[PDB]
Design a protein around this ligand. Structure first.
Ligand SMILES: [Cu+2]
Ligand SMILES: [Mg+2]
Ligand SMILES: [Zn+2]
Lengths: 307, 392, 143, 267, 308, 248
């Protein structure tokens, strides 16, 4: 139990911008915090880092207080956008953070080669791209064996080979036993790497659990499309007999929204008559699950192209 | 050239005292006997335009109340109105009216002559190079010229090598020079008033003399010009509005070594005082430099203290304070910058005089005193006007 | 334009004292500036003007009279030598216009004639300074 | 210690500021140029009052060029919120920036008045080397303290604002007010009242300006003239000794740094 | 009719050819994705489509004309990445400024401020805007007038996950009308549900163009079939290993099969024949995995176990 | 015309600049505070006003337009604006019209309150000369500001970062206000018998701050050449700025 948030309802200005979130996090899970209308996403983020005081509730990070110096050497925080110090170099920025966090100075030379920055080491940070600063910002987060990462959108401004390799670097640290929090807004793509999502909206933590549980606690249609063939006399009707609307949008894009309660007989309908080519069972993704829980609290569905 | 006995004088008193009646006369006239002659106001002794009209060779002559008109103009032969010989000692020329293009009162070699209360209107058309002197005095010891009215002559009251004599209360109008002084050791002049003159007071090579209480109203280009005057005393003079025509200097001190310059009033001219480099270390304290566009012109790098006994002069542009309530100011006053002497040293800086960089250089001197050339400062300047009586 | 010593007129005022120049005996210096010629009533008044610091840097040719080739009461315009290469005598009893009497010469022997004839000392142009002009005028018109 | 580990950054970040190294060489080439002009005019109480006027214009300038973006330049740069999740306090990342930028002013003026002294001992012959070292030892440990005043002023106006473009407006306002506006408001109060507003309260208004207390410290042994002082002529009427004038310079640091910490504590 | 006909251009700066032999044909309603990594080819192609650069060895035919005609650029939206507008101006005044420049009617300003959802933050300064609020403003100037081509270079950076999905709902509403647009992004999941045909390009050249069904068919990539309790985990791990397919041995009651998806029609029938398929997920090789393949195809040796 | 449609932006964006409105307010108090302490205590006070407006009207012009080109490249709108139906000339000329009328208004609040403080605090100023000596003053102060506006477009188009644009705009303001005349004064003191005196009036034409003062002090040159040489400083430097802006 790495992050033990219990009963916290943070109020400031008598506004109550957070209310009653009970967020226990295990020692190896990859939690995700996603916020829209609610300001809870940032306040709870702060609350774990120890730079905010929990009014009416207790925050226990790593079994201890969140602002203790003994746990702050074991934390790692990647903020949103950090243009660090434009006149310093790459090594001198990381040697500065190595002296503060108490890490050994031999880790700096093996983190500027672990992250792809040894070619751009000893070069000034004003001559860095946005992707190179996110690479450097991750490099101070892995400094001195952190048992709890806390990444606030680590994959912005980053080329797609490094983003896929970042989550492989994240997946090495899950096996090492370090709990990671991925606070993001780029929800398609992060759902393959998190273990448990935590969608919080209007302060109240709406839903928590794994991706298999969030699809179980929310009846959502699976978007099965069957290329090979769309064509129309029996493929419009052989699925609508039990209430599955075989709606298509192209030459063969019949996205039959099912109910996830008849997956044996519909695929036996699919493979028993008519030959298919490539079925794409598109499960309700983290984008679709997010808009269910958001709409279930306060949100009303926007119009056809109106946001 | 007839004589005064060739006229018709009716004697009022039988002690060589005569009285000329009203009626015109003609020609030059000569006094050879000690005659205390008076005149009626219609005694128009009009000469024909040649010769000295009233030549005087006898001592103790009280010429009074005459009215002379239109004498000669040969200045080389000294065509005067009243010529007074060296043998005519202690002559009194009292309350006379003169109008003619030559010398008004030419005296030479005389002693104790008294030229009192006359009104001498000189000329209008001559180019102020042949108008003749108003009151010419040529090496006289003892003279007493008082309360005259000289107008439109050439160089006013000329004084040549005359030692001890007073010039008291005479009004001098529309001339080139007001009072001209040449080698007049131990002279004196009090309370003279000068108007619209191309130099108000010429002080040339005359030592040990007292210049006190004189006024110079709206003169041209030189208020008081002093050349080579030593051990003199300049106390209480009022020099006002010296316009250009020179650029206008209320006092121009040229090669004057020792003299006391106190209680003066240099008002509304273009230059308040011009101090040349040769005239240094003289007691200049207590004056009033009000309204002048530039107070002191001193093109040097030698320091020059301008306050004897801890009292300095009143300056109109003195932006200072006085904490302990005495009459003196607390901070010293430098009238000239370093950039105020670059304009004088190099006249091409006049194109650059309105630049902000020049305005930077005025502020850099007030902040960094190493670049301050040693100028014409005065410790303890005055806070109020000391010449409260000279404005009347 | 600086090559021409201009002649004197009767209506020529001094630059300093402002009075009429040709009413006086003695040599009369003048200064050609090449923007406007200014003239002087005496050579001592020119040398008093030359030693002022506005005119130390001023490029102007100085011309005085040659009293070795002229009568002292009425000097002709005529021969007018350069004042830097002259031989001024000082301390004589001659009556100049304003300052001390500085009779200018060009041959140093005629300057040596008048020095012994009055009790003076010949001196060059560069030896003239403002400590000497005020000293010599005090010995002439003082006491 | 953590206060030194964050001072070692600012010592190595301020020395790469190209705008500092221009105007700290400008302080070196002017303190030689003033001392060279003070040597050719051989006077001495004018070359002390001119060097102290040079450090009145530049030691507030180097201090405000360093530290106007010390807190708000890290806050909008994102690296301040990260730094509080390190084992630090808010009191260590302010006192550490004060030590780091303070050693730059201790080195930028040891270069300036150090090379100014070598243009006197090697230029004007026969100066008293005991008196030269003592006067320029008093210049070094009092112009550093003036620099540390405006360093601590800059932490007040960096913690108060929330945008770095508005921090440059306040840092230019502090440099204009304390250097060349407060000496002119006191001048205009003395000119328009002709010195009769208050003959005893007015010398105490010099203590409300640390650039004026700085001029009063170095001009102790060299009174000299009065127009070299100007509005420092009230400093003869201040009855405080020289030791209190040091303590009022240290008190300008300690009140305006404790204010800088109390502002940063409620950031 | 084609919007963008890049016909064999070759853009060079000095001796280096920063974009070599690019050959695109964007259709009349297609959504194309310019994805680039090492190369600046993505950036140079972006400039070539606009009037910013000139083709040094080819030609571009934007909307059947030259790319620098004023009739072209009045029907050409372009949202650039990381744009930050005039911060002392207001949100309504910025669009009223940009509507005057594009020749759009001023009655379209208040529609597009309402359309992107900026009505609450209109008449507020741009300095008090968030990152996603400026992306809504930067999108709103791209929709000015009646555009026929949009170059949305990274439209959903800093945007809310409702607004990200709402933006793509405006895209598929737009492409039905007939305005063929171009996505330029680096977040490869999220665009993959809406990209009509990818245009993955390497350092110099153009690697692959075509639909997502054509990239998965060309690049032989294995299907990621994950299941949970069909019949039994241990009884089904053996079958694909004898049939020559990888069956991953997960923790309990879960069958992960990495099959070669060419034979998976009848192979999934036996999976149906022994258990229920009630919780399975066959995953196609995604656009993230396809783009990683084309980097491997030309240069770009893969990083280690976990490195970058 | 889109040279005006982009000018209405620069009016609305320039008038909300807090840095500009602080200096333009400080210009209007000091133009009153010089006119108050220069008449009661008119060509004598218009010369002290000319030295004030030589300090601040280059400073007002460089505060407006040092980030005109490079401030839009960092803002990202410069790449956006070139894809609009707009030439590179119309962006520069439209910024020059928009920033030009700002300091054409900054002399109307600067000298509009200074000439009001002269026409109501002298009582006998002979105002027929006032509306011609200030009409020549307000026109010539805009043209001085339009030179440094065109100087600011030269330094904006050359640099690539916003921080070095302010580092060059400070360098242009130091060189053209108070380094060019100080190196004119310095040469004269160092060399006075070699430097030509006549040459220096002609050498004043290489400085638009110097040509600004010469048409407020009325001399070997006439008046009409100085107006056509001040306009030549606008027309060359705008043509120079357009040649730099076409090479981005
Ligand atoms: Cu005379
Ligand atoms: Mg006093
Ligand atoms: Zn003369």
């Amino acid at each position: 139990n790495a992050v033990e948030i219990q009963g916290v309802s943070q109020r400031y200005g008598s506004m109550t911008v957070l209310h009653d979130l009970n967020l226990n996090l295990g020692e190896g899970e990859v939690l995700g915090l996603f916020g829209h209308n609610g300001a809870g996403k940032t306040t709870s983020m702060k609350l774990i880092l120890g730079l905010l005081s929990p009014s009416e509730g207790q925050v226990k990070v790593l079994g201890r207080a969140p602002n203790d110096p003994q746990v702050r050497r074991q934390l790692g925080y990647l903020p949103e956008n950090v243009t660090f110090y434009p006149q310093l170099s790459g090594r001198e920025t990381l040697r500065h953070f190595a002296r503060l966090k108490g890490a050994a100075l031999t880790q700096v030379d093996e983190l500027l080669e672990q992250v792809g920055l040894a070619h751009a080491a000893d070069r000034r940070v004003k001559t860095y791209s946005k992707g190179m600063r996110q690479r450097l910002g991750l490099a101070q987060a892995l400094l001195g064996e952190p048992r709890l990462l806390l990444l606030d959108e680590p994959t912005v401004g980053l080329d797609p080979i490094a983003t896929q390799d970042l989550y492989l670097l994240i997946d090495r640290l899950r096996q090492r036993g370090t709990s990671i929090i991925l606070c993001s807004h780029v929800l398609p793509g992060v759902e393959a790497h998190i273990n448990r999502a935590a969608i919080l909206a209007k302060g109240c933590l709406q839903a928590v659990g794994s991706l298999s549980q969030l699809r179980a606690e929310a009846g959502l249609p699976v978007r099965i499309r069957a290329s090979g063939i769309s064509e129309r006399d029996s493929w419009l009707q052989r699925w609508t007999d039990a209430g599955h609307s075989a709606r298509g949008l192209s030459e063969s894009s019949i996205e039959v929204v099912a109910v996830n309660g008849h997956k044996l007989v519909l695929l036996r309908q699919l493979l028993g008559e008519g030959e298919p080519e490539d079925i794409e069972i598109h499960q309700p993704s983290l984008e679709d699950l997010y808009r269910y829980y958001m709409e279930r609290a306060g949100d009303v569905r926007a119009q056809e192209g109106r946001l | 050239a007839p004589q005064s006995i060739t006229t018709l004088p009716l004697q009022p008193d039988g002690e060589n005292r005569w009285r000329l009646p009203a009626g015109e006369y003609q020609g030059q006239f000569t006094i050879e006997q000690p005659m205390q002659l008076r005149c009626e106001p219609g005694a128009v002794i009009q000469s024909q335009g040649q010769g000295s009209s009233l030549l005087i060779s006898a001592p103790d002559v009280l010429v009074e109340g005459c009215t002379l008109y239109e004498w000669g103009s040969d200045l080389t032969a000294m065509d005067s109105a009243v010529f007074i010989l060296p043998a005519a000692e202690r002559a009194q020329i009292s309350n006379n009216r003169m109008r003619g293009p030559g010398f008004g009162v030419f005296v030479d070699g005389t002693r104790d002559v008294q030229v009192i209360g006359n009104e001498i209107d000189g000329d209008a058309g001559v180019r102020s190079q042949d108008r003749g002197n108003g009151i010419h005095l040529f090496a006289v010891s003892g003279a007493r010229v008082l309360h005259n009215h000289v107008r439109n002559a050439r160089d006013g009251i000329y004084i040549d090598t005359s030692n001890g004599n007073h010039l008291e209360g005479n009004v001098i109008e529309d001339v080139r020079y007001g009072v001209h002084y040449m080698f007049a050791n131990e002279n004196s002049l009090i309370d003279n008033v000068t108007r619209r003159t191309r130099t108000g007071y010429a002080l040339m090579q005359s030592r040990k003399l007292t210049v006190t209480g004189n006024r110079s109203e709206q003169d041209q280009n030189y208020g008081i010009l002093m050349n080579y005057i030593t051990y003199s005393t300049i106390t209480g003079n009022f020099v006002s509005d010296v316009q250009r025509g020179g650029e206008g200097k209320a006092l121009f001190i040229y090669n004057s070594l020792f003299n006391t310059i106190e209680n003066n009033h240099f008002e509304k001219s273009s230059l308040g005082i011009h101090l040349t480099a040769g005239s240094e270390d003289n007691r200049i304290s207590g004056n009033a430099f009000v309204g002048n566009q530039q107070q002191v012109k001193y093109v040097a790098s030698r320091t020059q203290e301008w306050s004897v006994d801890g009292r300095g002069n009143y300056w109109s542009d003195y932006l200072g304070w006085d904490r302990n309530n005495d009459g003196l100011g607390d901070i010293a006053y430098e009238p000239n910058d370093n950039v105020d002497r670059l304009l004088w040293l190099y006249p091409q800086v006049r194109l650059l005089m309105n630049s902000p960089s020049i305005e930077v250089l005025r502020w850099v001197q007030r902040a960094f005193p190493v670049i301050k050339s040693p100028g014409v400062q005065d410790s303890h300047p005055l806070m109020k006007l000391p010449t409260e009586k000279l404005l009347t | 334009q600086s090559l021409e010593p201009v002649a004197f007129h009767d209506s020529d005022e001094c630059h300093v004292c402002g009075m009429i120049i040709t009413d006086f005996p003695g040599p009369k210096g003048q200064a050609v500036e090449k923007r406007g010629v200014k003239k002087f009533c005496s050579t001592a008044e020119m040398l008093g003007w030359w030693l002022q610091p506005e005119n130390r840097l001023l490029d102007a040719k100085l011309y005085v009279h040659d009293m070795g080739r002229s009568v002292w009461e009425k000097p002709d315009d005529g021969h007018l030598i350069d004042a830097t290469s002259a031989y001024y005598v000082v301390g004589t009893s001659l009556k100049g216009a304003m300052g001390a009497s500085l009779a200018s010469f060009a041959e140093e022997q005629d300057a040596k004639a008048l020095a012994g004839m009055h009790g003076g000392r010949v001196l060059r142009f560069e030896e003239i300074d403002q400590a000497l002009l005020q000293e010599a005028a005090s010995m002439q018109h003082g006491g | 210690n953590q206060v030194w580990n964050i001072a070692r950054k600012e010592l190595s970040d301020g020395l790469r500021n190209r705008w500092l190294l221009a105007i700290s060489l400008l302080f070196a080439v002017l303190a030689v140029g003033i001392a060279w002009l003070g040597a050719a005019a051989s006077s001495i109480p004018a070359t002390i009052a001119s060097l102290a006027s040079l450090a009145t214009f530049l030691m507030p300038l180097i201090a405000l060029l360093l530290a106007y973006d010390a807190i708000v330049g890290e806050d909008e740069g994102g690296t301040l919120m990260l730094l509080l999740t390190y084992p630090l306090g808010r009191g260590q990342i302010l006192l550490g920036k004060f030590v780091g930028h303070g050693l730059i002013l201790a080195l930028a003026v040891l270069i300036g008045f150090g090379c100014a002294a070598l243009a006197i001992a090697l230029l004007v012959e026969g100066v008293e080397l005991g008196m030269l070292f003592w006067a320029f030892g008093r210049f070094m440990i009092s112009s550093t303290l003036l620099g540390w005043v405006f360093l601590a002023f800059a932490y007040v106006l960096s913690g108060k604002v929330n945008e770095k473009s508005s921090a440059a407006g306040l840092a230019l306002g502090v440099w204009f007010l304390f250097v060349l506006v407060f000496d002119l408001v006191l001048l205009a109060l003395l000119v328009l009242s002709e010195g009769k507003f208050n003959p005893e309260l007015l010398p105490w208004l010099l203590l409300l300006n640390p650039t004026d207390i700085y001029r009063l410290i170095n001009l102790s042994g060299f009174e000299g003239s009065g127009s070299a002082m100007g509005v420092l002529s009230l400093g003869a009427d201040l009855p405080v000794p020289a030791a209190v004038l040091w303590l009022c310079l240290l008190a300008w640091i300690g009140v305006s740094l404790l204010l800088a910490y109390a502002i940063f504590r409620r950031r």
